[PDB]
Amino acid sequence: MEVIELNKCTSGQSFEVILKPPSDPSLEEIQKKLEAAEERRKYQEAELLKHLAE
Amino acid sequence: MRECISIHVGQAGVQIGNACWELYCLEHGIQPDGQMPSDKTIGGGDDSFNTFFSETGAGKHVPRAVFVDLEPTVIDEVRTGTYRQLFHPEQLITGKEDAANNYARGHYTIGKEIIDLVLDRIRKLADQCTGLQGFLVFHSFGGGTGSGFTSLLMERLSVDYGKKSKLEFSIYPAPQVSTAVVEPYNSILTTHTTLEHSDCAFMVDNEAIYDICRRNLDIERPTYTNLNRLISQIVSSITASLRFDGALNVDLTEFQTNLVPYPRIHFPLATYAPVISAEKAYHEQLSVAEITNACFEPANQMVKCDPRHGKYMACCLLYRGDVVPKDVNAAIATIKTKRSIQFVDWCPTGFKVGINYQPPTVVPGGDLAKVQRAVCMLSNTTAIAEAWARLDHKFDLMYAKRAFVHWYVGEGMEEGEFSEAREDMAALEKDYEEVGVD
Amino acid sequence: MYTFVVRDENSSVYAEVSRLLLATGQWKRLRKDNPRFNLMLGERNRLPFGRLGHEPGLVQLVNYYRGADKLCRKASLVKLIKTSPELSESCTWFPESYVIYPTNLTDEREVFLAAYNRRREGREGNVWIAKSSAGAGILISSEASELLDFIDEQGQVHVIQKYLEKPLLLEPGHRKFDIRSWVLVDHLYNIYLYREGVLRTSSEPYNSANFQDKTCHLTNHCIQKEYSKNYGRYEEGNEMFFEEFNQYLMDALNTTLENSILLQIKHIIRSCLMCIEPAISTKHLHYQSFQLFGFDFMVDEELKVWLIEVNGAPACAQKLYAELCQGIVDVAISSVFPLAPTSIFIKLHHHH
Amino acid sequence: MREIVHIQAGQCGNQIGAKFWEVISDEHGIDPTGSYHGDSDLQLERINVYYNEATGNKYVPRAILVDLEPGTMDSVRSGPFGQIFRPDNFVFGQSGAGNNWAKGHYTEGAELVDSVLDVVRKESESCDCLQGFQLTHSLGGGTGSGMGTLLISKIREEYPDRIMNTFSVMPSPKVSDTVVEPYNATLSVHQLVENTDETYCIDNEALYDICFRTLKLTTPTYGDLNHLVSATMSGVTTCLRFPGQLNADLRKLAVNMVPFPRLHFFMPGFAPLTSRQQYRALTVPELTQQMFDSKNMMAACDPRHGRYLTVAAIFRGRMSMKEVDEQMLNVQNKNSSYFVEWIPNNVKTAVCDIPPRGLKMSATFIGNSTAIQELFKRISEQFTAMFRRKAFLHWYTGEGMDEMEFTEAESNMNDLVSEYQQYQD
Numbered sequence A: 001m002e003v004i005e006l007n008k009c010t011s012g013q014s015f016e017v018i019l020k021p022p023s024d025p026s027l028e029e030i031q032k033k034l035e036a037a038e039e040r041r042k043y044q045e046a047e048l049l050k051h052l053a054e
Numbered sequence B: 001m002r003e004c005i006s007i008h009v010g011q012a013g014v015q016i017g018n019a020c021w022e023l024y025c026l027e028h029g030i031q032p033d034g035q036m037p038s039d040k041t042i043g044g045g046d047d048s049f050n051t052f053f054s055e056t057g058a059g060k061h062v063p064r065a066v067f068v069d070l071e072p073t074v075i076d077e078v079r080t081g082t083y084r085q086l087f088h089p090e091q092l093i094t095g096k097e098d099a100a101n102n103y104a105r106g107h108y109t110i111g112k113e114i115i116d117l118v119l120d121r122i123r124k125l126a127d128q129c130t131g132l133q134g135f136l137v138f139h140s141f142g143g144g145t146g147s148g149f150t151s152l153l154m155e156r157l158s159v160d161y162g163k164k165s166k167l168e169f170s171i172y173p174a175p176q177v178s179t180a181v182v183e184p185y186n187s188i189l190t191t192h193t194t195l196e197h198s199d200c201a202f203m204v205d206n207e208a209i210y211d212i213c214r215r216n217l218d219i220e221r222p223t224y225t226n227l228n229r230l231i232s233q234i235v236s237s238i239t240a241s242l243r244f245d246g247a248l249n250v251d252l253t254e255f256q257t258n259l260v261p262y263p264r265i266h267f268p269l270a271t272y273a274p275v276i277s278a279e280k281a282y283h284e285q286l287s288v289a290e291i292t293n294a295c296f297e298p299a300n301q302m303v304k305c306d307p308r309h310g311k312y313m314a315c316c317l318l319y320r321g322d323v324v325p326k327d328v329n330a331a332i333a334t335i336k337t338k339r340s341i342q343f344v345d346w347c348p349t350g351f352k353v354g355i356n357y358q359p360p361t362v363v364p365g366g367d368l369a370k371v372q373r374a375v376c377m378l379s380n381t382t383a384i385a386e387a388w389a390r391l392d393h394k395f396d397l398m399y400a401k402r403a404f405v406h407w408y409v410g411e412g413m414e415e416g417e418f419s420e421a422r423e424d425m426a427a428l429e430k431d432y433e434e435v436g437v438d
Numbered sequence C: 001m002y003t004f005v006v007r008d009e010n011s012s013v014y015a016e017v018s019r020l021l022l023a024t025g026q027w028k029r030l031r032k033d034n035p036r037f038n039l040m041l042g043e044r045n046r047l048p049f050g051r052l053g054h055e056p057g058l059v060q061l062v063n064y065y066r067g068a069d070k071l072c073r074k075a076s077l078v079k080l081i082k083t084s085p086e087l088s089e090s091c092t093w094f095p096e097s098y099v100i101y102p103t104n105l106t107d108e109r110e111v112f113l114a115a116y117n118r119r120r121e122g123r124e125g126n127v128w129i130a131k132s133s134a135g136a137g138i139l140i141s142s143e144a145s146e147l148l149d150f151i152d153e154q155g156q157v158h159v160i161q162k163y164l165e166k167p168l169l170l171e172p173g174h175r176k177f178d179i180r181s182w183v184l185v186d187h188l189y190n191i192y193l194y195r196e197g198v199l200r201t202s203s204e205p206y207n208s209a210n211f212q213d214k215t216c217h218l219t220n221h222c223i224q225k226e227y228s229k230n231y232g233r234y235e236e237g238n239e240m241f242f243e244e245f246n247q248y249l250m251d252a253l254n255t256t257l258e259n260s261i262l263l264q265i266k267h268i269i270r271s272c273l274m275c276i277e278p279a280i281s282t283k284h285l286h287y288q289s290f291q292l293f294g295f296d297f298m299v300d301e302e303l304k305v306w307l308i309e310v311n312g313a314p315a316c317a318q319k320l321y322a323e324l325c326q327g328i329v330d331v332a333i334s335s336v337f338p339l340a341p342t343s344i345f346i347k348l349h350h351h352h
Numbered sequence D: 001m002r003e004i005v006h007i008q009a010g011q012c013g014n015q016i017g018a019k020f021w022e023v024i025s026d027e028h029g030i031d032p033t034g035s036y037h038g039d040s041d042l043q044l045e046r047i048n049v050y051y052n053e054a055t056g057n058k059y060v061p062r063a064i065l066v067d068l069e070p071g072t073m074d075s076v077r078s079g080p081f082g083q084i085f086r087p088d089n090f091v092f093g094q095s096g097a098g099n100n101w102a103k104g105h106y107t108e109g110a111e112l113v114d115s116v117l118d119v120v121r122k123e124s125e126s127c128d129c130l131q132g133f134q135l136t137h138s139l140g141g142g143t144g145s146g147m148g149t150l151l152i153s154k155i156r157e158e159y160p161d162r163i164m165n166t167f168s169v170m171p172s173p174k175v176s177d178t179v180v181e182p183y184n185a186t187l188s189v190h191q192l193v194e195n196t197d198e199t200y201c202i203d204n205e206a207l208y209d210i211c212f213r214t215l216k217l218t219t220p221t222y223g224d225l226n227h228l229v230s231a232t233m234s235g236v237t238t239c240l241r242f243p244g245q246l247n248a249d250l251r252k253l254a255v256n257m258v259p260f261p262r263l264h265f266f267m268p269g270f271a272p273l274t275s276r277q278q279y280r281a282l283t284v285p286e287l288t289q290q291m292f293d294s295k296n297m298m299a300a301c302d303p304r305h306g307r308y309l310t311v312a313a314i315f316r317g318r319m320s321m322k323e324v325d326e327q328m329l330n331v332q333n334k335n336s337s338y339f340v341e342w343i344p345n346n347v348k349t350a351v352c353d354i355p356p357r358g359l360k361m362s363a364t365f366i367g368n369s370t371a372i373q374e375l376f377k378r379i380s381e382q383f384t385a386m387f388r389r390k391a392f393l394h395w396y397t398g399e400g401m402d403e404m405e406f407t408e409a410e411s412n413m414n415d416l417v418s419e420y421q422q423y424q425d
């Protein structure tokens, strides 16, 4: 039950008690993912229009 | 002094952010017009509260915050509400149609066309920072914007601010106030892509806030305003160290150092006490031991789970009010001899304690009563993995039939991203088990 | 109309409980995967406690206490007794035990040998027994080399405890026996002891000069009915009940089952369950727990009662299924979900 | 400003659509001249969803009235709220469709479809953010069925990413005008399966049975049937016309109600339904018990024959939202065998403070139930009884159609039935 690093100031204080000792994707890659998903959306809508054109 | 930029994404993020900045102002004595009579340095200064508020020559204290929603109705409340004068129009960003509770819609379809505008507004605030620490991101799991756009933003922030910390305040979905059936999908999709970009995330289960409002505040049917005002007290307790003079958790880096020794396991459990109804005749003020002991009761945890059956990796006690170290240690000692507190063998069995003498501020007319002392315990427990288990189960039930999947594929997302996100969660659950069980 | 799910098809006890529940017409069984249930008769292993108590509007109850395995595991029990101040290492009703890990994997090998060498030097009785939870695999011997060697050949955790060399023998027959006590702990953590126990008796005369033949030393019902030749000679199915056993204690030893044995049994049950209460109580939890326990005791020739082990998923005597299972429904299930005596349990009061 | 464009086509579609605008115009305080005269701000909050705002603070419904003969629309224009519709929004021919799907879809209707789309395009060009479309029509006739589905196909072509919603009246031999209704209905269902996101199935037999058995109307008329449809259309659209968080717009409603694209046919229900003991107060348990009772449902399909994929419930009136959640949870917890267990929390409940006219409170029910396959089974059997003898086909082959198109529509609907059955098990 040891108290360490006790710091005190006008607005409060802090300390530490020890009870026992122990024992990314680049900007380019993100643009590709976004454009790839936008390309799959375009393809699906084109097939729908192709279907409605038939 | 080093600045902190807050980002609020989606309805949950925005409305919670609105409640926090209301509280921040009342705590720092800032008025709705941005004026702060106590600030004697007019138009500048590197005080602790300046980490969240900038200053103009006219003495206005402006939050370092950006609000983003793909639909305008929620953010329109901020533009015409009590604190409309705190923010300038650049800080409030709104689209025309939302993500329809569809992660893929907020991340890909709509996110792609507004992400650069949001980064531009954030860059402006960053330009006002002489030593930016990082970001605090508020959002929900279940919304299409809160889930889908947040993960896109977090990815870009890691790119544009590589050495900056990012903390989360995430709303875990609860059917009692749930809006969409697919929220388990969105929650798991956003956890998968955000996991490597978030240094520390505080999850709030709506179910937990909902039951605290009914049990402790005798609110029969809580509203979002009831939930958000309670959530902002806990959020305020967590950020107080960044806004006030102190020596514990003085910068965003210290949250990770003190609460997260393992990167993927970065979801500390929050526990708050006391929550007393304002309509009560007059409560018997609780002591340091009683409020501390209450930090080990499931009924006041932000996520209902049983910490007796997990292991601790860290524990912070954040007190506000009439508290001296002597009474804190006396309470901890008595709780060690009555409670089940097991730490992992590769971590010290200890508690970092912070005391701020100013008791919690209560919103005039709010639901919470004034208390002489309060505490918020942040503990990194493997028990919080119960929430991942619950969520992953619901995901498995629907995805086994591919129910609702066509809505996501229809926005350009590949079906494989579902299983990729799910496998990552299964690995997350396994990590918790390797650390907590024998 | 209450709802429940069955997730342990091999549970004879709760098979009857489920049968009785449906007989009331006020309980409805759902598929084992339906989350909207009031009561869960859960699986034995890996019961998903983390998914309980998150259904809006459903008070949920489960038939297992999370964390009770600490008491119902051979190794766990030894570690709980030696490390808990409430039970202490000097605990007088638990045989001297040690946790021994096979050498192919803390470990109490040296601590055991020191106590063993002490008995060998003092001329005292040095007969130990080895066992584990991964057994149907038991060895009784007086030489330490055989016990440890037998554990290394295995691959799971074992426990070596003192073998009660002076057990109380029933006459006629000169035979060993043990006492099974069923204990039900409800959601309020009341400790109810079923008034009816059973003595699982050995139909073979107790022989202290040959531990190689384990028929007269192990009183397990399956061993007596498989390797013993006098099965069912003295009592039907080697199951003497409290009425007969009590009358025996009065005719032979001039005492009662209550005074000579039952007091110690009730004291042991309380001490074990009260010890772990803070760790398993569901008093302030989002779900509620109850659980049926099977305590196994030994009695020596001094009428001193020792604890052998605790069973978390025990079975019941064929003659007592009806009474006990109905008792589980009354105090464990209906106490939480009431329906539209002379209790068969003995409440063991205690301080929470 | 999430605007919806409304279209009503044919006799049934315009008569029911008329009453609908009559009911909600009263709910929002709009009088027959388009002037507002309410006393609550909630009425105007979401008024722009269905009404355009003209000069002089006038509110004009965003509705397009379509028919191949003038008769029914002449009635509307002379009806109660006829003056409230935009005169330019009446698009009609003179030939009629003679209850012939081929005429409405291929010949007569094709000549008129482009002009209808010009008006739709005009209404959309003024929308700040168009949500989508809702169409009212029957499937047993020629115009609503044949030209109605033609409009939908061409609307989805021009607005592929907007939500297409319909209130479709399914024919019944008990309330029948011609023997060809199963032909027209089967041809339309195939169109609807492909091109709508949400279809509310209103079966005329269910409406008849309700008027007779439950409402005690000795001789039900089309007007009586349309009262129930008006009230139901008002109930389901409450989420869109007033402040709310759940199913707030068309796309969010679809996301929560449609787990599979083809299974988007809903059973609607309304409560209370009282015969003139009509002043008695209705408790929340009663509202919930009735709302889930089959006799209160308008698809003529017993829910106990299948399972609910998703349920959307809307309670209207000043009531205990706490007591609402309790009773809702009680229905799911007392009959969880009729809800699929692989869609957690698939029953969503919404509340609204403004009750319908002349009711302290009411409840509207929207169910995506696999029991709807019984409705398509009836139509399929009636179709096949005639098609096996090619009876009455000359009316269609005379308009250019071939028998193959009937065989395909037949197989497509039987596939829909098989799809509903696999999810019921």
Ligand SMILES: Nc1nc2c(ncn2[C@@H]2O[C@H](COP(=O)(O)OP(=O)(O)OP(=O)(O)O)[C@@H](O)[C@H]2O)c(=O)[nH]1
Pocket (backbone or CB within 6 Å): B009, B010, B011, B012, B013, B015, B016, B069, B070, B098, B099, B100, B101, B102, B106, B140, B141, B142, B143, B144, B145, B146, B147, B171, B172, B173, B174, B177, B178, B179, B180, B183, B206, B224, B227, B228, B231
């Ligand atoms: N605690 C709290 N939770 C909220 C609040 N608003 C929404 N939620 C929760 O957030 C989830 C829904 O996500 P939203 O934030 O509303 O959706 P969104 O981020 O705006 O994304 P969209 O789909 O485009 O609307 C539900 O589980 C709600 O319970 C709020 O103000 N406070």
Ligand SMILES: Nc1ncnc2c1ncn2[C@@H]1O[C@H](COP(=O)(O)OP(=O)(O)CP(=O)(O)O)[C@@H](O)[C@H]1O
Pocket (backbone or CB within 6 Å): C095, C129, C131, C135, C136, C161, C162, C163, C164, C165, C176, C177, C178, C217, C218, C219, C220, C296, C298, C308, C309, C311
């Ligand atoms: N220390 C000891 N002294 C004397 N006998 C002992 C003993 N430990 C075990 N036994 C004998 O072993 C039997 C109990 O074995 P144990 O309970 O450990 O194995 P087990 O768990 O597979 C049987 P069950 O769980 O069904 O009671 C008793 O009948 C008893 O006679």
Ligand SMILES: Nc1nc2c(ncn2[C@@H]2O[C@H](COP(=O)(O)OP(=O)(O)O)[C@@H](O)[C@H]2O)c(=O)[nH]1
Pocket (backbone or CB within 6 Å): D009, D010, D011, D012, D013, D015, D016, D097, D098, D099, D100, D138, D139, D140, D141, D142, D143, D144, D145, D169, D170, D171, D172, D175, D176, D177, D181, D204, D207, D222, D223, D225, D226, D229
């Ligand atoms: N509920 C209801 N059904 C109608 C009404 N008018 C016609 N129907 C039904 O609709 C079908 C006839 O279609 P109809 O609308 O008259 O043909 P259309 O003018 O070519 O679209 C038949 O099944 C009728 O039973 C009405 O006013 N109300």
Ligand SMILES: [Ca+2]
Pocket (backbone or CB within 6 Å): B039, B040, B041, B042, B043, B044, B045, B046, B047, B055
């Ligand atoms: Ca200053």
Ligand SMILES: [Ca+2]
Pocket (backbone or CB within 6 Å): B158, B162, B196, B197
């Ligand atoms: Ca990073």
Ligand SMILES: [Ca+2]
Pocket (backbone or CB within 6 Å): D111
């Ligand atoms: Ca012509």
Ligand SMILES: [Mg+2]
Pocket (backbone or CB within 6 Å): B010, B011, B069, B071, B098, B143, B145
């Ligand atoms: Mg939103």
Ligand SMILES: [Mg+2]
Pocket (backbone or CB within 6 Å): C309, C311
């Ligand atoms: Mg055993």
Ligand SMILES: [Mg+2]
Pocket (backbone or CB within 6 Å): D011, D012, D141, D177
């Ligand atoms: Mg007609």
